[PDB]
A paper describes a structure:
Since GSH was shown to effectively stabilise wt PV2 VLPs they were soaked with a molar excess of the benzene sulphonamide derivative CP17 (VLP:CP17 molar ratio of 1:2500), applied to grids and vitrified for single-particle cryo-EM. After image processing, a final set of 51,518 particles yielded a 1.97 Å icosahedral reconstruction for the wt PV2-CP17 complex (FSC 0.143). Like the binding mode for GSH, CP17 is bound within the VP1–VP3 interprotomer pocket of the wt PV2 VLP through two critical arginine residues—Arg243 and Arg258—from neighbouring VP1 subunits, which form hydrogen bonds and salt-bridges with the carboxylate group of CP17. The bulk of CP17 forms hydrophobic interactions with the network of residues forming the VP1–VP3 interprotomer pocket of the wt PV2 VLP. The wt PV2-CP17 structure is similar to that of the CVB3-CP17 complex (RMSD in Cα atoms of 1.1 Å), but there are differences in the precise orientation of CP17 as bound to wt PV2 VLP and CVB3 virus, although the key charge interactions with the carboxylate group of CP17 are maintained in both cases. In the wt PV2-CP17 complex, the compound lies flat due to sequence differences between PV2 and CVB3, where VP1-Phe76 in CVB3 is replaced by VP1-Ile89 in wt PV2. The interaction of the C-terminal residue VP3-Phe236 in CVB3 is absent in the wt PV2-CP17 structure as the C-terminus of VP3 is disordered in the latter, the final observed residue in wt PV2 being VP3 Ala235. In total 520 Å2 of solvent-accessible surface area for CP17 is buried in the interprotomer surface pocket of the wt PV2 VLP, representing ~87% of the total solvent-accessible surface area of the molecule. Interestingly, the greater bulk of CP17 means that the C-terminal residues of VP3, which becomes ordered on GSH binding remains disordered upon binding of CP17.
The Enterovirus (EV) genus of the Picornaviridae family contains notable viral pathogens that cause various animal and human diseases and are regarded as potential zoonotic threats. These small non-enveloped RNA viruses contain 60 copies each of the viral proteins VP1-4 arranged to form an icosahedral protein capsid. VP1-3 each comprise a β-barrel with extended surface loops and C-termini that form the outer capsid surface. The N-termini of VP1-3, as well as the whole of VP4 (N-terminal to VP2 in the VP0 precursor), form a network on the inner surface. Glutathione (GSH), an important cellular reducing agent, is a crucial co-factor for the morphogenesis of enteroviruses, including PV.
Author numbering:
A (entry chain A), D (entry chain A): 24 to 301
B (entry chain B), F (entry chain B): 2 to 8, 25 to 44, 79 to 340
C (entry chain C), E (entry chain C): 1 to 235
G (entry chain C): 1 to 60
H (entry chain B): 86 to 170
I (entry chain B): 2 to 8, 25 to 44, 79 to 85
The structure:
């Protein structure tokens, strides 16, 4: 967020110093300023880079998931009375691309849950205000098997009970990585296959570290069902905070295809433009 | 207690024990000789050397040491220049890639230490050698990519198998276009790294954000990249995880004033640096083929 | 309790807000950081890195490595441009997808000097002088060296130093330019011409390539974060 | 907001000084006080101009837009599930006229959103409380094409989620002009047509600077549709704050006609009044 | 948390409220101001500028430049008024649409002395003496010079200085007057008469024009901001 | 921290980082000689001179300089009095208007510099000259209007074309009434500036809020307005943007004791002042006709 | 009263929250503690105690 | 570097300052005309590139005159033709 | 009154008389004769 250097007055030049000429082969960028190649006036620079700090770049809540749940009679096998969403930023694209400008990152994370609901039909009465349970299931904790099984006691899991109509729920977590930074890219495997092991052993997905690195969110409607079916969507908004990032990378240029770096479609991003056309 | 900060001030108070609860606070260079162990490299047409991110390789500091067992530091027995198999730059070449430490896994005592230990750490000195005549032309971009993940060849995500992801010293080659592997019975499960997508869905033109040099045949015949250990951990498993990728892309095609297709060799010579190993046990023998 | 009065904006959720919230995992033993190389603290640091310009977006070259190569040859001298582009670093298709352009496409406003570097990738035996020009906007775009040499320009001598940099100085009526194609904040025209010509001896390739790079100077800044058009998702 | 000068006692005058006589040709206003032409008593003046400061003059929220959106089945092609309003003060007249008393202005801006909703029919059931998304789309950011496309992830755009029944939403922005002040009037063009250019080139609207200077607001109902159609209006209230203004102008006298200074109707504002009629 | 009690007015939106709200664009790099000429800090500054009075709102003159011109001639002396208007600066149609009147129509109350200036636009060879009068209200409006000269008045000699100013002093029962037509806060009567007559030599125009201007004195103030009736909108 | 302010006090605390979040804080004169460059103006019947907004023209201070290239300051070659084509004041004349810098675009080296540069800045000295006899009568209001936008002639908003909006030295004339252009095939796309609406929908009587003088034929025969550069930017494009308008309206009609219609000329002499140009390139040639 | 603005998370119930709440039994005369042997202050203290490993989990 | 124009060269043979005298403005001690002069500076003191000529085996040589050769070169030419001196 | 504690600090105030209302504060040996 630092200010910018002033432009210094620069007059005619006639000398053996040639800042214009360089050698990009060295791998360095020629740090020229306008006064190196043209005559410049004195300008007291007042612009700053306050809004391009990494913190400012990521200081936005981005939607990373839309978790759909129902409030309906359990006999209705079509309805889904609870939903489990594995935590990740890779279900949407925008925040993913912003994060993947970099190879490593540390940040606290602010989760904000925006809950919307609606009737599905109009001939089965009405509903009282719903309460939603959002339980964090860290890896290894038992995953709910039913909307009302014992796991929802949440004696040790953190849970947020959100009352419909209240302002979106919000919680914060610190940096919870087991490494010293989050790895946006992992060039490796969880397993190394060993010679003599059958083809079904030692095989792991390329670039995946843990089968379950950050656990899940289990969402249900706590209320018992009304005579009419209600559908709800919980939109999850992530905001990195206190961000640090390492090893910048070129941003994604073609559409994402899965959680890896794979690509299948849209491999022609650049449009056509004449070489000598302005 | 209460923090008063300039914007005419504003007051901030933290109401929660945990810091995560806190609100976001917005406040000549051509001639070189390199010596490592018993190996020496001379060059008369260098373009200086690039120390990636300006960080020289170093051993793990006590303040950052995760494993507690006494590490092994073979020093000269492993921190030495190993020369990889030479590749042939032709007019049609689309580029080459290697992974580190994978490329060095069969390189003498470095490879032995790598496979005898659960944990390994090393920086590198990569020296790309490509000489031609004053009548040749062409340019190679040499990029050191941390966590150089490459795109697969199938509809199944993240499906490249360990054997193909770790080709060893031979490395692999970038392709000019994406070919989808449709053989469902016996999938290749191989990378399909497209050159202009830099093999990972990012425009190759932007790969210069990575530590890099250019071998411009009219200017220099070698590139030297000094890579520190880069990872989210002080030390990691070298067999599971490749810390660095080396990519070589022909930025300008090889050309020479002859009807016959000219070809010149590119030779990679890589020295591990500040090698450190932990967790000694029986030797790991990775599955191959 | 204490008398309070709820003001407008209460109970809203502004995605750009900066408030405190309760920690869902209290007393967590956070893993300390290590000194990873290559830390970045401002996105402008990324924009200041030279990245190659896809200068040649013709039908057969676009979306291939060839789009990065501009072909020069040793033909007789001419005043016709070698390459032409507009100083719209965020919207010009040749600049939009560089690292500078990618960063700009997350912001609404940009200001500062740009830096175009050209690398000659011919043989050592090839010689030549080129002219790289920037014409601030408001006049007809330079279509020959005669008009282009009236604007800002650098005459590049191809020799031992195979790269030349032209700084496009910040010359704008407004204190910032928009990151879209808009005549009010148009940036001007960048062009390249043969000053003398490329000359090669016998037994030397008569056609060679030059590569273009662009980066931001130290006076460069952006503002008004926004979502880019460079990434999209489908149901 | 300064106090006013006291009136000083003034007695009979018989002298060669003639403050009453002047020459308006010079372009100056004769700064006479009552004591210059009549006998006055001493008056300790207590009136002040606190409420005619420019800040006080503009310290009011004015309605600048009424954005109508619907919550209805997407198959109903008549319903409008999202709306995009280009940001401007020229859709209404009152604030526009007040602002156009002056040629240039700098101000921060407070936006307050008053959201109202209603049923459209009575034979299709009821609705749960709606949540509205108001996303600022700065110029160049992708405009939503559908009420539920990717753009609503708002990873970088600021968005306000407003819960129906909550007090009107409110946000603030600083002075965001790319010039050193906002220009209420621009006597010029975005393009200068050049000789030899076809008639279709170099043509721009008179007085327009940018085709999109401040971007848009995209408004939707986040909830999935209920069985009955709901209509909502988001009224946008602007309040300039920390106002500075330059170069006063005569106020608009005839009805506005478009965003320029053009006029078509109501060109006879003055009524009839006898010259010698009090 | 801290015990609180919500008071009446909570959750309302008062359009005149002055509360803080979250910034939707944090850390924005605001363009600094420049020293533009002509900064205005109080609307009264605008009211203190003389602006021409549409004094002659007859059927054929209203809504034309002619409405600004009052015709004098060199006829024999008479006591009949040249022009007559009421001191209702916000509601009198001849004053409502001046800059002073336009500003007043955004406020409910006004107080202070007014300043009427008259510019004689006849030939240099024309001479004359006029009488400009202000009669505070409560009596019959002056319909001849005999009544008008009993009130406040200035006798204007047309000479080298072609303009004359009459200050209408603040004379009011109430500390403020309303900006509407209302007998309780009526302001009085302004009139003009021939003192001697206009005299011209031969070969000179016998009819000329005078122009009227009005402004506020330095003791003038307004209060109770309100919406004007001078602008309207239709669906 | 907490601000205590008189109203018996009240307490204000800013809870937000950004200042925009803060609540609103309510707290003889007849004889003159002018010399510029090689040009001189004398007058014996002036009415003093008006410096618009009391601000003399000045060059761009370093603290406000937006463009970084060294500016051009031709000084006397451009900062000199140019005399525009004389117009004829008649009984029926409704008024005249010009735009600056537009009116001076063909004036020697000022015009050359204007068209050779992307950016231009200048104040002005406008001198309106109108002499008559002691037996004439009439009054001209001379107004310098910043950003003098004029109303168009069609139902299409903001439709006046560049060519008609920039007539050059000839300027344009106010009309006595609004005539709507109904020719849809070949629209005139011209201004229709009505005199009593001051050509922009505002009562002409209020135009005196603008910097102005009055040429009252019985009193003075000239008016002098010194205009600083007025804009929302330190410097702008002179071809795209007219910073000032000059309006001349007959406040009192011209009259003279003769049956035949008298006519007297009005001559405008305008000197750019503190001219400053940036962004040199090939010359701009605007489309005409 | 004092102008306030309710933020996101208002009215939620986070089971891990640490807020104050009113006492339902004010002025209760709490029984003082005694020095019971074997106080534990960290669960790791329990993990540091050797416990027998069911090493032989065969069918029988 | 002059004005907005820059020339680079990697194979020069040093530069020759004719008669060892750098160009200079007219000193007051040598000023003949009394009117205030115009000094356009960067608008005119900049590198203009003339039409390129072709050196062949048969070429006998080329000549130009100054300021004649620059008479059509932008603002230098304009100033040249607008002024007596 | 107000307690300022390290986490860069945070402020805690007890609003209730009873302590229960307070938030949770996270701060040879072989031979013997008997
Ligand atoms: O309305 C918007 O904000 C919103 C609208 C569209 C949008 N992009 S999308 O490509 O249409 C899209 C649409 C849905 C999902 N998505 C699911 O379908 C889902 C199921 C379960 C868990 C998580 C998710 C999840 O992310 C992801 C992306 C994102 C957000
Ligand atoms: O109820 C009142 O407060 C309100 C009522 C009337 C009113 N004036 S109006 O002339 O009737 C009028 C009526 C509607 C709109 N208007 C639209 O129709 C619209 C559509 C989309 C975006 C913006 C707008 C917008 O301003 C503008 C003016 C303003 C506000
Ligand atoms: C209701 C409480 C829920 C709390 C959830 C805490 C989980 C925090 C997850 C943060 C997400 C970090 C981003 C992911 C990092 C990289 O992808 C991984 N290192 C690789 O998978
Ligand atoms: C939800 C967040 C929305 C934030 C919107 C920020 C935009 C701010 C717009 C302020 C309006 C300024 C008034 C317009 C000025 C003049 O008309 C322009 N200079 C000319 O078009």
């Amino acid at each position: 967020a630092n200010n910018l250097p002033d432009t210094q007055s620069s007059g005619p030049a006639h000398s053996k110093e040639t800042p214009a000429l360089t050698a990009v082969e060295t791998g360095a960028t020629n740090p020229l300023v306008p006064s190196d190649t043209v005559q410049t006036r004195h300008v007291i620079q007042k612009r700053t880079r306050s809004e391009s700090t990494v913190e400012s770049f990521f200081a936005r809540g981005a939607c990373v998931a839309i978790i759909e749940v129902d409030n309906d009679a359990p006999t209705k096998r079509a309805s889904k009375l609870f939903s489990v969403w594995k935590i990740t930023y890779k279900d949407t694209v925008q925040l993913r691309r912003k994060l993947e400008f970099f190879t490593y990152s540390r940040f606290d994370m602010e989760f904000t849950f925006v809950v919307t609901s609606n009737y599905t039909d109009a001939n089965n009465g009405h509903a009282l205000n719903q309460v939603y349970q959002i339980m964090y299931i860290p890896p290894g904790a038992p995953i709910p098997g039913k909307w009302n099984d014992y796991t929802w006691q949440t004696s040790s899991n953190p849970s947020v009970f959100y009352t419909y109509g209240a302002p979106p729920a919000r919680i914060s977590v610190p940096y919870v990585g087991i490494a010293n930074a989050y790895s946006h890219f992992y060039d490796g495997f969880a397993k190394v296959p060993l010679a003599g092991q059958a083809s079904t052993e030692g095989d792991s997905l390329y670039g995946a570290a843990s089968l379950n690195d950050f656990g899940s969110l289990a969402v249900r409607v706590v209320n018992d069902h009304n005579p009419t079916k209600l559908t709800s969507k919980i939109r999850v908004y992530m905001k990195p905070k206190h961000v640090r990032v390492w090893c910048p990378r070129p941003p994604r240029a073609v559409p994402y295809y899965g959680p890896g770096v794979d690509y299948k479609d849209g491999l022609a991003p650049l449009p056509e433009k004449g070489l000598t056309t302005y | 207690g209460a923090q008063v900060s300039s914007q005419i001030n504003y007051t901030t108070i933290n109401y929660y024990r945990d810091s995560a609860s806190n609100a976001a606070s917005k406040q000549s260079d051509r001639v070189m000789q390199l010596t490592l162990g018993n190996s020496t490299i001379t060059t008369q047409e260098a373009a200086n050397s690039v120390v990636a991110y300006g960080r020289w390789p170093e051993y793990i500091k006590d303040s950052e040491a995760n494993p507690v067992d006494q590490p092994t530091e073979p020093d000269v027995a492993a921190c030495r220049f190993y020369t990889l198999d030479t590749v042939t730059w032709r007019k049609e070449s689309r580029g080459w890639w290697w992974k580190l430490p994978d490329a060095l896994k069969d390189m003498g005592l470095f490879g032995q230490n790598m496979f005898y230990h659960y944990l390994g750490r090393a920086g590198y000195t990569v020296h790309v050698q490509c000489n031609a005549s004053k009548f040749h032309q062409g340019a190679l971009g040499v990029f050191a990519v941390p966590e150089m993940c490459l795109a697969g060849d199938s509809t199944t995500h993240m499906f490249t198998k360990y054997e193909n992801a770790n080709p060893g010293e031979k490395g692999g080659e970038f392709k000019g276009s994406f070919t989808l592997d449709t053989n469902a019975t016996n999938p290749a499960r191989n990378f399909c790294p497209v050159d202009y997508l830099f093999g990972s869905g990012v425009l190759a033109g932007n790969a210069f954000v990575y530590p890099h040099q250019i071998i411009n045949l009219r200017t220099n015949n070698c590139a030297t990249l000094v890579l520190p250990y880069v990872n989210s951990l002080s030390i990691d498993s070298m067999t599971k995880h490749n810390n660095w990728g080396i990519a070589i892309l022909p930025l300008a095609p090889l050309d020479f004033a002859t009807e016959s297709s000219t070809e010149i060799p590119i030779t990679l010579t890589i020295a591990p640096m500040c090698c450190e190993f932990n967790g000694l046990r029986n030797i790991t023998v990775p599955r191959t083929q | 309790g204490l008398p309070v009065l709820n003001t407008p904006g209460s109970n809203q959720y502004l995605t750009a807000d900066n408030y405190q919230s309760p920690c869902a995992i209290p007393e967590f033993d956070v893993t300390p950081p290590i000194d990873i190389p290559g830390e970045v603290r401002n996105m402008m640091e990324l924009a200041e890195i030279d990245t190659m310009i896809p200068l040649n977006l013709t039908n057969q070259r676009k979306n291939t490595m060839d789009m990065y190569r501009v072909e020069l040859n040793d033909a007789a001298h001419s005043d016709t441009p070698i390459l032409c582009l507009s100083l719209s670093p965020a919207s010009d298709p040749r600049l939009a997808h560089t690292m500078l352009g990618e960063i700009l496409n997350y912001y609404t406003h940009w200001a500062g000097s740009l830096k175009f570097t050209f690398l000659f990738c011919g043989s050592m035996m090839a010689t030549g002088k080129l002219l790289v020009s920037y014409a601030p906007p408001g006049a007809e775009a330079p279509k020959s060296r005669k008009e282009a040499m009236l604007g800002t320009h650098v005459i590049w001598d191809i020799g031992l130093q195979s790269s030349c940099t032209m700084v496009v100085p910040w010359i704008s009526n407004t204190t910032y330019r928009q990151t879209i194609n808009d005549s009010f904040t148009e940036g001007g025209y960048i062009s390249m011409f043969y000053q003398t010509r490329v000359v090669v001896p016998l037994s030397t390739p008569r056609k060679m390539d030059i590569l273009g790079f662009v980066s931001a100077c130290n006076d460069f800044s952006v503002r008004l974060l926004r979502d880019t058009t460079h990434i999209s998702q489908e149901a």
